[PDB]
Design a protein around this nucleic acid. Sequence first.
RNA 1: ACCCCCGUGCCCAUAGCACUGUGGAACCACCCCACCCCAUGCCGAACUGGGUCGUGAAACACAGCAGCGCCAAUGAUACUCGGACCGCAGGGUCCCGGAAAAGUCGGUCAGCGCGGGGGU
Lengths: 136, 104, 177, 175
Amino acid sequence: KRTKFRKQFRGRMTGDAKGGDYVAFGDYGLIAMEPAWIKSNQIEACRIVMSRHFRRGGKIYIRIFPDKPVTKKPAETRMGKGKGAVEYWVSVVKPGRVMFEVAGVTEEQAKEAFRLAGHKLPIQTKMVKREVYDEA
Amino acid sequence: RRKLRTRRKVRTTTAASGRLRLSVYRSSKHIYAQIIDDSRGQTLAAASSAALKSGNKTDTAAAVGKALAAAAAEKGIKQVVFDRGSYKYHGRVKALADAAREGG
Amino acid sequence: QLKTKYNDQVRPALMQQFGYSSVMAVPRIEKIVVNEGLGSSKEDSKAIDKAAKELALITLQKPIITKAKKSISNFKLRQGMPVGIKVTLRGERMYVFLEKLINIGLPRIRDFRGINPNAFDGRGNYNLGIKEQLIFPEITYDMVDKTRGMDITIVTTAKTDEEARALLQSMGLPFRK
Amino acid sequence: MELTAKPRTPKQKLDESMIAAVAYNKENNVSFALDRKAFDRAFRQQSTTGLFDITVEGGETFPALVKAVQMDKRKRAPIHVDFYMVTYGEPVEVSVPVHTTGRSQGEVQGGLVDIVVHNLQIVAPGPRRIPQELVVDVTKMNIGDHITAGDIKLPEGCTLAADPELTVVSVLPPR
RNA sequence: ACCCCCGUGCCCAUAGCACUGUGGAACCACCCCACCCCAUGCCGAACUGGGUCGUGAAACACAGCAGCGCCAAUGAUACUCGGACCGCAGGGUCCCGGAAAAGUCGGUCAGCGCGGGGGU
Ligand SMILES: [Mg+2]
Ligand SMILES: [Mg+2]
Ligand SMILES: [Mg+2]
Ligand SMILES: [Mg+2]
Ligand SMILES: [Mg+2]
Ligand SMILES: [Mg+2]
Ligand SMILES: [Mg+2]
Ligand SMILES: [Mg+2]
Ligand SMILES: [Mg+2]
Ligand SMILES: [Mg+2]
Ligand SMILES: [Mg+2]
Ligand SMILES: [Mg+2]
Ligand SMILES: [Mg+2]
Ligand SMILES: [Mg+2]
Ligand SMILES: [Mg+2]
């Protein structure tokens, strides 16, 4: 969720992601296919769904993180003073980027958990078990 | 002890335009001196005192300046740089100077 | 002199106790050091001359005023204020001070059982820390206004704590067995 | 295995979905290209510890370990491969999968085992005698224990290439 | 001509660090002494002035070595001038040249002058 950090506001455009195409932690991983912002409560709902389905057990990693501030001008004004101070934090997400990955849960239950979590994300997404991997 | 060497060596080869180098070495009882043409990677007129002996180092070195002044004099030496190593223009190397260019 | 009785009493004694090809390879003493540190919490300009006078009289050498490093902090830290008193002793005077300690700084002690034996540097060459000034040959409580405490680091070209340990033991330093 | 072309031009490669390839060592680092599906059946059968022979359409077999694959981020398919020609001195710093044996007694009271390092890069495996896996018995482990590299047993002529104290597999508590 | 030392440059990490070995009476170095030239905001530690011996201890010089740094390919990819397209949009594609970063293979513990000293 919200970071405790630095400059309030930013900008925006896109290109395919590089910083995490492969599933390092855990066994399985759901993975993004579209370039939307993800932001805060969207993730946290993914987290709370999977933690319901799995917890008492399993290991849940959230490799994505609401870095990027996004702004809302007030109410109903004209293009006025500056931008709007707050609103929500997002994480940009490009295809092949891994958002989620379970540990210690059978293949089928990871299927169902990824299905639930992905039914509330702006992007469609595909899951995979980790092929052979390199990058260490 | 180091930085003073490269310090005066940078201020010497900045002031070096036309004029030749004259690097007195003093750390031992070897007060060797050279006349180096910066640019060309060459020296031409060293006056080391491995064979000479005149007593106290301040006066032994004195003759070294005198020896050198004759050598460069045979080559047509205008003036020169001076290029002290680190030695604070003291009586032995100040004497090597007064002896070098009193007799130049 | 009092040194060469020290070196030959030890230099062969360590070259005999331990093999070294060179007399130069035997540990020596680079310098005595005294950090005074006066008024490090007491902001006493009247006492700056206090510690200056006590050090210059008891140490046969002039002291410098190690000024505050200028790491101003929440507490009374600031840049340019004086904060300590350094005095470096080399050669003859350092040997005279080491003799004043070995012959009057161990008699000076209260309740002696040695000095702390665990060598301070991992490289050796280490520093006594005075806990009280009352019993020095020069520091009389009657002539003095009040008691204070100083510091006395000493450097040795020992390559290990064990070697400077043997050297400072043979030289006349007491040890806490 | 088998492979044929190696032009600097790639327009032929994409159509028949054959992967691009290279083979190299000290003496010759020549590039090549090979069929895709057979390569994937092979790379399944053996990972970075497995090896296979390549028969370039020149008439001489060569023995190659697999060293790195770099493939599409969007499409999951592999794109490019780097086989490594290997002399029969010990192959350098090969990676070995970690695998766990037994039902840990930590699993039986609410814990679960977690392999903190899915691969361990050991030096001097010894070529042709390479460890294709690495079994670690976890049954002794209880909740909160760490089976470090100072535990993992090794076959012939092998020495761990990673710091022994580093955590490998660890049992973990509930939640 | 061969060897090594003292200076001194070009090049300044492929030439730097760490572990190790070898050098002393050629050379350099520590070292001895210091009231004075001279000097330390206190200390000859450093500058400094007079010299053996002793010792190569430390330093420095040279040699080994690839643990560390530093160099660093090929294959491919990213991106892209130009050309032509798709998607409502975020965004994507094709032909044509250009072409990284990183990482793998490997490469290195330099190379090149001037002088003077002393050896053979
Ligand atoms: Mg984009
Ligand atoms: Mg693009
Ligand atoms: Mg990366
Ligand atoms: Mg040299
Ligand atoms: Mg060494
Ligand atoms: Mg000889
Ligand atoms: Mg000395
Ligand atoms: Mg040595
Ligand atoms: Mg290429
Ligand atoms: Mg063009
Ligand atoms: Mg275009
Ligand atoms: Mg192109
Ligand atoms: Mg590169
Ligand atoms: Mg070397
Ligand atoms: Mg030469």
